Design a protein around this ligand. Sequence first.
Ligand SMILES: *C/C=C(C)/C=C/C=C(C)/C=C/C1=C(C)CCCC1(C)C
Lengths: 228, 224
Amino acid sequence: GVEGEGIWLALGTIGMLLGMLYFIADGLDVQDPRQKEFYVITILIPAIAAASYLSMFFGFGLTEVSLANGRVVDVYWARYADWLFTTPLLLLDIGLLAGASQRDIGALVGIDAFMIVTGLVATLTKVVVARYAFWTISTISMVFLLYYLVAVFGEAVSDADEDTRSTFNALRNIILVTWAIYPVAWLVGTEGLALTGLYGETLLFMVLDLVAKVGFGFILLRSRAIMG
Amino acid sequence: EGEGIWLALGTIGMLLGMLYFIADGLDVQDPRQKEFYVITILIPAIAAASYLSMFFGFGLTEVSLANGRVVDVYWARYADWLFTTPLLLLDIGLLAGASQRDIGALVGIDAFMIVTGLVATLTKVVVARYAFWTISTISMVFLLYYLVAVFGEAVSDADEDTRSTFNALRNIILVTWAIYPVAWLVGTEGLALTGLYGETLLFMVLDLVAKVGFGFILLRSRAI
Ligand SMILES: *C/C=C(C)/C=C/C=C(C)/C=C/C1=C(C)CCCC1(C)C
């Protein structure tokens, strides 16, 4: 790619298509409207992400920023477009599985979308302390997201049968653990401190996205907690 | 009903083709080639997004006719064909060495054909259905004629590889595009000689051969 990162973009692409395939194929033996609902939402997730990843491997959704630093940073802004559509969808999925109110769910995507958007400005500002600034409020907003996820969606599902509560716990644990890594991957890649470059950052976002989208969806879709 | 299976299979196969082309795309290093890889990869992706919808049941509304019948129309196919058939046209075209005005003209006729194809599907007045189906079927003849006539002479001075690859690609287009007006005819939207099931199976076939069979020949061609 630009700095060897093209392999991750490609594996990421195919990893998403493969998970999407499995979900589709597993969609065939579905017989319940509530079940089909999680299926559409869940197939949608890596669909979109695969699109994003594919456009980046072609060389679309890739721009350059000149920082006041005098450093020039290579930004795959398509990630953010992807995340803007997909991360609310992940919130929808688990919120619906949790029995959370529509208001509860909206509350969360609201903060989520704020998160992705402040991440986008932190990625694009030429003023370098403003990159750290907007990264920080972006991480403050993520911490609140993750607080409200376990508190609010966890209280909502606390009266479900074991299957639903534990499928929920597993999902919320995939989110707690993988999402929390995103800002650290950002901080250490070219976008933040530039410890590792583009190569290391892409790979991490590639591993994290796959766990976050395919691993997530596989666990949810392989659960009867999404029937009714 | 039960056509949902071919819609799922259609997505899978389509995604499969996209998978083959992507893994095949890693090797590309000429900008010209890349350009063929993205147009081509984008074709089954749009179609995958298309079958996906009709699988979910999204995009399959019902129209009741003047003569009383109420035909289930998967309108999403028309949304697919609207972007996809001109991408296919752009593919052979660029491969043919044809001009922007050569290629533009054709998608002008391709757009006309698809759209009157849509109104023929959606008209409740059955004389109009057949009228619009006919005028669209005849657009295609112009389309297909100009395609071998004008793209054919564009590629005639090229190398044997692209020539032979082009002929192959106009052959696929010739053979499979010409079935589409008869799939529409013998199916629920036309004379209902087949149900949703066997009409879908058929359109699933044609779409795989016309998109993936096509892409495979092109992307795996020595020419590109
Ligand atoms: C990949 C999708 C392809 C190649 C779709 C092709 C569609 C056509 C050639 C449609 C043709 C039609 C007519 C010629 C007239 C009646 C309406 C249509 C849709 C059947």
